[PDB]
Amino acid sequence: MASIEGKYKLEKSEKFDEFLDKLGVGFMVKTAAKTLKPTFEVAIENDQYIFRSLSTFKNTEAKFKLGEEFEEDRADGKRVKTVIQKEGDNKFVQTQFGDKEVKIIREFNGDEVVVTASCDGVTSVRTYKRI
Template identity: 60%
Template sequence: MVQLNGSYKLEKSDNFDAFLKELGVNFVTRNLAKSATPTVEVAVNGDTYTIKTLSTLKNSEITFKLGEEFEEDRADGKKVKTVVNKESDTKLVQVQKGDKEVTIVREFSDDGLTVTATVNGVTSVRFYKRQ
């Protein structure tokens, strides 16, 4: 069985700039974000999940229980209501609701993590290698 716990380093991004632009992130921040190579750390402790994203640009952390709404700061700086559900043993689906609805799908494998984020029909896929 694939372990979700672990550390993942960004290897490749597809359409990330277009996603951030659609989200409303400004030009300077988008360019900084494109050049960053974040590490994602995932920890599951009982029914509590913690996902940390660490980079030279910005660090963020969310802690949640599946199916329970919580508030977080989105990539564009806006506060949104978020719910994360587990669709399978290897797939988490996060929905952020605010002025724009963002869906983030995290799919885990033995090799890494694929993060697919969509806003207003614009999709970005980021590939992370398990460390």
């Protein structure tokens, strides 16, 4: 809980059109990548993690434990695996069934977050602007 909470928006837009093939979205996030429409909020409460998604062609909040693993309907209307685990107290790693098994990594530098997506053979990199 080292102030790892906050609201953060897309601020790079590089290999998104390839990564979004695994995320499950289409043109609606490809056009959101020309701006900062896709955003997330991380709210680390002293019981559970609240993983607010404002990307995925659907803004919505999700609330779960650390290192949990389930498969339920979320985003635009897609049921895929979801497991979110904070590495140490600063890196965050998450896996979803997406199209087969994508792995996203997010590391809290302090003013921004480095994203590292990687699937079967599809890798992405975006810096998220935190505010």
